[PDB]
Every structure is written in C-alpha cells, then in structure tokens.
Amino acid sequence: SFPKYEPSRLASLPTTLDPAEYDISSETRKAQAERLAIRSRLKREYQLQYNDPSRRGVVEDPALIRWTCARSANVYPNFRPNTKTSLLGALFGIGPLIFWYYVFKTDRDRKEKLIQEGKLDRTFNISY
Amino acid sequence: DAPPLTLEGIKDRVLYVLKLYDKIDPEKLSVNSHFMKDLGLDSLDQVEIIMAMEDEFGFEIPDIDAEKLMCPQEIVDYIADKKDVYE
Amino acid sequence: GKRLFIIKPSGFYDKRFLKLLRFYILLTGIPVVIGITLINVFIGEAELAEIPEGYVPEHWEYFKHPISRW
Amino acid sequence: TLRWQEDPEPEDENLYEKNPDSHGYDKDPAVDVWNMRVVFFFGFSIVLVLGSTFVAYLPDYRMQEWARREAERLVKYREAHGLPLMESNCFDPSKIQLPED
C-alpha cells in the first residue's frame, strides 16, 4: 500500500487523515453545533462592542487578561513542592552551576599551573 | 503595470471563458443563467468552472465562497468585491 | 485621471517636532561653528617653546588651543 | 445588593481635541508652548551644543598628550646614548634589601 503517515510532536496529523473527522454520529453533530453556538455568541459580543460609533478606546478581551494572569500571577499559589518539582529544580538550578564551576576551576587551575612553570607562551601578552 | 478593471470587462472576460467551455451551448447562456438547473451541469462541472475563472483572473477563490458561485452574475460580483472596482 | 485619496496617519506633528529640533539645534550650532572658525583663523593655536630660565608659567599656559586655555 | 459609593472611572482626556496645536505639555496653550520653548532651548541649544563644545576642547584630559610628548622626549634621549628603552625593574636593585634566606 502507501506508507502510513506517523505523526510526531512537531508534525501533526493532517485533518484529512484523521479517522475521527468522518464521524457522522449525532453526538458529534451536537458537539459541533454547541461549539459553533459559543463561537457565534462571542463573535456577536465582539462585533457589538466593535462597531459602536460612540466608542473610542480598547475593546477589552477577558481571555487575554486571563492568559496573562495565568502566566504570571497563578504559578506560586498553584505550586506544591513534591518529588517532581524538587527533582526538576535541583536538576535545572544547581546542575549547570556545578558543571560550569568545575569546568572553569579545572581550566584556570591548569592555566595557573602552566604559567608558574614558564611553559605557557606569554611573549606579547601585556593586555589583560 | 496592473491595468484597471471594470464590470463590463469582467463580465466580457467571464462570458468569454464560459463560452469556450464545450459543455455549454454558447447561444443559450447569459449573465444570470444557473448551472445545475438552467444549464444542466454537475457539481464537478461547477468546480472546474471556478478553477478556470481562477486561472483566468489570476487569484484564488476559497472553497467556502466557491460553493455559492452559481451564476455568472455572482462570479462578476464576487470578483468586483474582491478587487474593489468602480472606485 | 482616477486619483484616489490615500489614508495615512497625521504626519503634521512629527514634521513639526523635527523642524523644532533642527531649528533649536542650529540656533546655537551655527554661531558656535562660526566662532570656532574665527578663533582658529584669526587667533590661532599656540606654538611649543622651551621655558625661559627663571620663569614659571601659569597653569593654563600648558595647552595649545585658545578655547582649552580659556 | 449594591456596593459602596464610588465614582466610575473617568474618561481619558484627549489633549488634541480642545487644542490641535498641543505639544502635550499643558492644557493651557500658553503654558504648553512656553514649556516647549523652555525644554527645546535649555535642553538642545544650551546643554547639548555647549556641552559638546566643552567636552571637545577639554584641556588635555588625563594627561594623555603630555604623556605622549614626554615619551617622545625619553625615547629620543635613550636612543641617542645607546641606553635600553625600558628596564625589567622599575626600582633600582641597589636600593632594595632582599630578605636573607
């Protein structure tokens, strides 16, 4: 046959290859009608606030304020210290610091040991 | 570059393209002749007609507007609206 | 024939600011450049010379340009 | 129920409505135009221009030109007599007492 399209995280399945697209059952039709009703009601609200001749300002979007408040001012109230959070914090917080510390300490120890024996060429180095 | 358009030129060109179609008798069609009823064409014939008019005018008509273009007058009005003619 | 109105934002205030900025810069820029040219041409720069015996210079007699000495 | 007594949020004032020639400084046109004149004169004509002129003619900032002239004199004097141009020791070893070991 033809090679089956395997979806990935960075390459989604197309809408024409989804087996759930061709569903004709009444529950999915009811769901699609409800979603269209929600979208049409929100669009009616927006267009009523949008076409007002007496309005001069910003049509405020509660979804955007909700998104910014969730991104900023909810993280610590909804944070619980458990195994996953502490493990990720120790991995991403003190991991790179220790790694770079050992790298730089080893390099500077090697350089300072080579300098004091006069094995490192420092002939024209007078800028530091 | 970019010569302007008018309803007369749009109608003449769209009737030219529809007149070169072999499935339509040229002595019978007009500006408001229907496709399924007045001319006896299938839906695939309508799709091929819409693709021919897209190739003629050089711009793409989306499908959600292509399903409703059923007589030459609506094609003329759609092109006139999309290209903002008689300004 | 067939000229259409082009809708653009109000460019009056930006041009007014640029004109005001240019005028108020040039209002002292032109006299300062003229004065620097007249200092350079007619007064001129100093000439390096050895110190005479027994003579102590003032602290401003160690610089070349008249404006720096002033 | 109805909440506490409080004025609603006032509408934002457009400064260009009552005064199309506004510079945005003040609502009174005379105060606004005088603030514009004050800022543009004492900021650009006075501070920027005369400040740049002052910085341009600084009297030998941090002795760099004097150092170059003295280096020229010292290099000429040391080159004329065959002396080395610079020594490895800044101070004379004769006037330095090393610790005994």
Place this chain on the structure above:
Amino acid sequence: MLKYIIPTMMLMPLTWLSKNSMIWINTTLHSLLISLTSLLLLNQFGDNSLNFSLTFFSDSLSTPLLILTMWLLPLMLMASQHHLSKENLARKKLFISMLILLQLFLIMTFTATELIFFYIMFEATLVPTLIIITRWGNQTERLNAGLYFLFYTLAGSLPLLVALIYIQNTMGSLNFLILQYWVQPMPNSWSNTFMWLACMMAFMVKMPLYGLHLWLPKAHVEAPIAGSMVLAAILLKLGGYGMMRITLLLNPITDFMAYPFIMLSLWGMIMTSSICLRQTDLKSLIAYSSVSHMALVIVAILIQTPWSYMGATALMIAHGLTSSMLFCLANSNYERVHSRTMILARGLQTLLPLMAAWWLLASLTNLALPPSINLIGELFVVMSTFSWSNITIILMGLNMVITALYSLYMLITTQRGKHTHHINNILPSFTRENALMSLHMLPLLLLSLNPKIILGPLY
C-alpha cells in the same frame, strides 16, 4: 561639591513657591541649568583625583555617574508630568520634592570620601524611591514590590554596616584616600571569608546578582515612569560603585571567593535572557534585560582587571541611558493603550512612524551595535573574561545571540505586523515624548565620538 548640593536644595523652595501651573517649567529649567553646570567636574588628572575637601572627592569613576544623575533628573520631570496631570497640587509638589531629594542623596553618594558616609547616603536613597513606588504606582502589588525591595536591600546591607564599622575600628580610618595607602593583605580564614561576604552582599543584592534578583521585576514594574527611570538608570549602579570602591580592602581573598558568584552571574545572564525570550509583559522584559546586563558588570568587577573595569563603567553608563529610554518608550505605549501586554497593541509603525524609529534606535543600542558605548563596554568585558578563561567566550557568544533575539523580538512584536483592529485611540506622538526620546538618544550617540570620558579612573 557644595556648588552642586546647594542649587539642588534650592530647587525645593523653587517648587514649593511656584504657581499652580508653572511648577514643571521652573523645575525643568533650573534642573537643566544645574545639569549644564555639572560639566565642571571633568577637570581630571592622569595621576591625582579631584579632591575638593575632607568629606568630598570625585575621581574619573564617579564623574560619569554624577553627570548621568544630574542629566537624568529633568528627563524624569518631563516624563512624569502627563500621568500626574489630574493630581492635587500639593501631591504634585511632594512628587517633585521626592525627585529632588533623591537627586541630592545620589550626588552626595558618589562623592563621599568616607565609606560610612557613602553607606549612609546609599541607604538614605531607599526612602524616596520606596515612597514613590508605593504611593504613585498604579497597581495593587506596588505595596508588595516596595516590601520586597526594602527588605532585600536592608537584609543585604546590615552586615555591610557591621563590617564597615569593624574596618574602621581595625584600620583606624574609613577615608578612601587613606585606605589606598594603608591597605593590608587579607589572609585566608573563616573570619575573612565572612568579612568578604558581609562587605559584598549589599552590592550583590543592589546590582542584582542572579538568585537575589527577585525584587527587580516587581519594583521596576509597579513603579511609575520616573521611578522606573531612576531605578534602572542610577540605583543599580550604586552596587557597581560600591564593589569598585570596596574591592581594594578584600585582597587577595577575592581570587577564590569570587568563584561562586562568577558562576552564578555567567549562567545567570543566559537564564535571564531566556526569560526575556518568553515574556508577555514589556516592562518585565526590560527589567530582566537590566538583570542580564548588571550580571555582566558583576563578572567584570569580580575578575578585577583594567580592561574589565573600563568595560564595566562604560557598560554601566550605556545601560543606564538605554534602559531609561526603553522604559520611556514602554510608558508611552502604556499611556496610549492602558495595558502593559506586549501582544495587545501591534503594528504601530503604520500609525507612529517616528516613534517606531526611536524604538529601532533603542533596540539597536540594546543589542550593542558598534560603535556605541554599549558595544565598547560589552567588548572590553568580553576581552577581559577571555583573558580569565576561554570558555567564557562560549558563554558570552550565547548571551549575545539571545540578546539580539529578544531585542528584535520586542521590536518586531510591538512595531511590525498587522495593527490591532479594535484599538482606535492611537493618538499622534506629542512633542514632549519625542523631545524625551531625543534627549535620551543624542547624548548616547554623541558619546561615541569621545568615549574616553566614561572609561573609569584607569583609562
């Protein structure tokens, strides 16, 4: 230094005896006159500093910071007079009075010869900024921002007071001219380790160090525009001046006690730039960019080489000017659209073209376009850190790439693209905002012609 202190305190009767409509004109005019007068401090010598009195002196490090402060005050007066339009007259005079008092404390801070007088002024600077933030800030959490800022600074700075008094009792003087000649080596012990921590943690908090920076995206955000300008432009540099003055007494223990903070600040700038890549708030993005640049200055001071010191002072001045301009531009957007969200108002180049040009210039100086003094400072610090170790070039190159990324992300998001449909109150730019932008830009571009006056005391 009394010829600058006395006109500054004479600004107070000028703002308290002016008319109801002439306070801004009088204060701006006379502050600009004193700013012009401040150029007389450039009488610097190649060997000796300009020592005025027993209490005051000004070498080539404190002079650019002084000129920056005295030039920054009229900019804050011009910026802060639109959102205080409907305010009570007495509250307006109190706001101008706090600005004047802050400038007085700042010009007494950079010239203090004694270290305890420097400490007293450096912690007297806390009260006017805290009052400005917590009173004239617009949000709910300005009180929490003030609490965080105050307590971080005081918890960092009380051991500094204890250590400075110990140094006074042990050495006999805190005069900086005496301590240059009376200094002694500091050996390796636990006592000297905690001496180093006590003398350094106040300026590490105030700069800020990565991990102690949690007060900055609050105090920089909930403040008014003048508060944000004076916090980004001057107040972060008190820590830099303190570490430049105090490192003299901490040798040779710095060479190994500086390792953990070098690793914190080298990795910290990558973290803060990455945070800048995913910020929904413009003001917070500018604050985190300030954190990254001050981390660069921290590394430069800690490796203590001449090139690093020159790069550190040049970068301090350049970042002060650039951060002040960026905060002013963000404030103009906030006055137009009444929201700090970066995704809300888009495509403003089709509506505000000259403001878009100012945005482009500020973004270009943010990513260190040569030959700006931003690039001069960043380049000198990069050279000195390469001399320190070679993998620092990997870290610095990554930081430069992410810095260019988030600066152009700022510019492309705010100015380019399709404009927002439902926003129709985008007024044309006032002459006041354009004058403020040009007064931030033109000194920054002019200083590239003579960059030798911002390169510190060892140029």
Place this chain on the structure above:
Amino acid sequence: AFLPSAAYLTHQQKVLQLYKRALRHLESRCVHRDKYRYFACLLRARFDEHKNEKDMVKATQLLREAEKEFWHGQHPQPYIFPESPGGTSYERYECYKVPEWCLDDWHPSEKAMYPDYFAKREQWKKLRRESWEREVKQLQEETPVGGPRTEALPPARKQGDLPPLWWHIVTRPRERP
C-alpha cells in the same frame, strides 16, 4: 472544520474539496498544458466512475482511501497563487492599510487640502451614527433566545435603514492602497 455559518462539512463538500486539491496538485506535477489536460481528464473519469454510489459506508471508505492516495502523491511544493496564503506576495500590502479612523486626528491645516472629501466623510459619519441605534434594535429582536446559532447577520428588512454591523466591512481598505 472551521466554518462561520455551518458547524460541519458535508460529504459532497469534502469530495469537491478533494477534487480541487487533487487537480491543483496534478497541475503542479504536470507543468505543461496538454499533459495536464490529459491527466485531468483521467482524474475526472476516475471521479465519475464512483459518482453513483448509494452506500454511505462504502462512499466514506472510498473518500478515506482517496485522501490517503492524495497524501501519498502530493507535490512537495505545489503552485500557490501570489496573493493566496503561503504565496510570495501574500499579506504584502498590510503595512499600507491604514484604517480610516486615523483621519480624525489630522491637523486642521492639512485637513484644508481636501475640503470636499472631508465634507463627504462628515456626512458618512452622520449617516453611521444616525443608523446605529436602528440597526442594533433590529439585531436585538432577531437573535433567538440563547444566543445566535451561526455567525450570519440579517439584512435590512424595511426601507431606509442599512444592514446591521456594516461600517467596518464597507469602509475596509482597498487591496492596493
């Protein structure tokens, strides 16, 4: 999928959209006109062979295998029109589409250059602010209880009044400003 006036896509709509996509991609593979004409007729014959099928499950399976066949044989980069999304000149002129509310902030000195145009603008704005309350009253009584079901707007039923919500879709900028 995503439709303003409908909640779903019918079977015939799916077949027609597949037919148009397949013919466009076949034109992309077959760049010459005669070759494309020949293979378009072959594709049309293939589509007309299964036109008269009444089994719904069999027609659904035919549509699914046709979509799989199209996905196996699509062009890596098909021909996109220059103004079509994904085109080379798509959304190119969006930087020049200044909205019409910016004319209210013009200085009177530059408003005097176009007297008749600004008079016509004033009478247009007078018409809009006169008709707004009538059109919102028409829209209020036509929406069923529970909100609108689709996004289609009604026309003006009686004489004199304009269709509801007409301003921002009549005064939209031209394609080439």
